[PDB]
Amino acid sequence: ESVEDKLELRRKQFHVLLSTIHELQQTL
Amino acid sequence: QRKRLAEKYRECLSNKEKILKEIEVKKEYLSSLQPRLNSIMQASLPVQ
């Protein structure tokens, strides 16, 4: 459960980074 | 005194040209780092 929570946190961080890259591509 | 005032005006014009060159360098650095960050994000998304 701890490993799954860490993997879900890494997946949410990667999704937040992809959303920030999409917002930067939309703003520029 | 007029020659010293002309030299001070030339130094002020050189400082203004250096400030304009720094502003142009910052604008070109932002314009280059925008596509550089886009390419870095496109490279990071394949690794992700």
Question: Secondary-structure blueprint of this entry?
Answer:
This is part of a larger assembly, with chains A (28 residues) and B (48 residues).
Chain A: H1 2-27
Chain B: H1 2-47
Q: Helical content of chain B, roughly?
A: over 70%
Quaternary structure:
part of a larger assembly
- Residues in β-strands, percent of chain B: under 5%
Report the sheet-strand fraction of chain A. under 5%
Q: Characterize the overall form of chain B.
A: rod-shaped
**Helical segment count of chain A:** 1
Q: Give the end-to-end Cα distance of chain B, rounded to a whole number of Å.
A: 68 Å
Name the helix and strand elements of chain A from N-terminus to C-terminus, one letter apiece: H
Number of β-strand runs of chain A:
0
Rg on CA atoms of chain B, Å: 20 Å
Which chain pair has the greatest contact?
A: A-B, 7 and 7 residues
How many runs of DSSP E, i.e. beta strands of chain B?
A: 0
**How does the major sheet of chain B shape up?**
none
Quickly give the structural class of chain A: mainly alpha
**How far from one another are the termini of chain A?**
40 Å
Protein name (chain B): THO complex subunit 5
Subcellular location (chain B): Nucleus; Cytoplasm
Modified residues (Phosphotyrosine) (chain B): 29
Organism (chain B): Homo sapiens
